[PDB]
Paper text:
AdK populates two main structural ground states: an open substrate-free state and a closed Ap5a-bound state.
P1,P5-di(adenosine-5′)pentaphosphate (Ap5a) consists of one ATP and one AMP molecule bridged by a phosphoryl group, and is a good structural mimic of the enzyme's two native substrates. Notably, the electron density of Trp171 shows that the side-chain samples two rotamer conformations in the Ap5a-bound state, and the wild-type Y171 conformation is partially overlapping both of these Trp171 rotamers. In sharp contrast, the 1H–15N heteronuclear single quantum coherence (HSQC) NMR spectrum of Y171W bound to Ap5a shows two sets of resonances at ambient temperature: 61 of its residues give rise to two peaks of roughly equal intensity. In the crystal structure of Ap5a-bound Y171W, the enzyme is fully closed, whereas NMR measurements show that Ap5a-bound Y171W exchanges between open and closed states in solution. Overall, it appears that the Y171W mutation shifts the dynamic response of AdK into a regime where fluctuations in the Ap5a-bound state become slow on the NMR timescale and hence directly observable.
Residue numbers in the entry: 1 to 214
Write the structure that this text describes.
């Protein structure tokens, strides 16, 4: 199975990706996680993203397209994959199409703009896995600790309010058109498209997604 997670910053894509990955046995491909990992390791493919992410801007298409091509070429992706935060622009989506990458589902995560800042300012992450928590809305079992490894959680450099507001502008201008892009693809029979209410509790969004994915 091949799935695209689509949605504004903090809509809950990464959170729900964890369950989808476990349930259907396909790897999570998060361009955000991959770019951040590249910056941390000083990897030649992706380290350039550092200043761009700080500014709250989108990384260039050709850079993220290359990262995705390399990643989904790995053997853990021969049986399907979960694209999380990719594609983020029309050229990224067309690049998939040109590459002949079919998808089964496009899942839109809907949240009001007014919830996004308070979500991301309370976000804590386990960088090695990509697991995500929230100090108020979805805390770990033990404070500041990853539930699975027990390792110390961290705060993303780009998760301050001002940076979030800039990512939100970027999403409305560059990414929002992908709703129509894939809705049109769905009408042509090339994929299914579904929208979920991401304001519900984590467990319920999970249930709604399971109902869609069967
Ligand atoms: N294709 C691409 N092309 C170009 N540039 C790219 C790119 N991909 C990345 N980049 C670059 O990387 C930068 C960062 O992008 P990115 O890594 O995608 O971060 P983002 O813009 O902040 O949005 P996310 O996708 O990480 O949020 P999310 O939908 O996964 O929500 P989450 O589960 O975390 O949840 C949010 C918070 O709310 C909590 N929460 C989750 N669900 C719920 C719920 N139901 N109820 C209450 N709280 C919840 C969570 O615990 C969490 O704390 C970009 O600016 C760009 O420069
Ligand atoms: Mg994500
Ligand atoms: Na398809």
């Amino acid at each position: 199975m091949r799935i695209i997670l689509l949605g504004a910053p903090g809509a809950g894509k990464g959170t729900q990706a964890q369950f989808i990955m476990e349930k259907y046995g396909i790897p999570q491909i998060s361009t955000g996680d991959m770019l951040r990992a590249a910056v941390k390791s000083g990897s030649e493919l992706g380290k350039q993203a550092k200043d761009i992410m700080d500014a709250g801007k989108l990384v260039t298409d050709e850079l993220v397209i290359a990262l995705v091509k390399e990643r989904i070429a790995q053997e853990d992706c021969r049986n399907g994959f979960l694209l999380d935060g990719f594609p983020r622009t029309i050229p990224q989506a067309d690049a998939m199409k040109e590459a002949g990458i079919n998808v089964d589902y496009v899942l839109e995560f809907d949240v009001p703009d007014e919830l996004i800042v308070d979500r991301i300012v309370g976000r804590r992450v386990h960088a090695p896995s990509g697991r995500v928590y929230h100090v108020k809305f979805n805390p770990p079992k033990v404070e500041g600790k990853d539930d699975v490894t027990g390792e110390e959680l961290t705060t993303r450099k780009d998760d301050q309010e001002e940076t979030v507001r800039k990512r939100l502008v970027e999403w409305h201008q560059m990414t929002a058109p992908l709703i129509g892009y894939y809705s049109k693809e769905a009408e042509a029979g090339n994929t299914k498209y579904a929208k979920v209410d991401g304001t519900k509790p984590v467990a319920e969004v999970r249930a709604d997604l399971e109902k869609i994915l069967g």
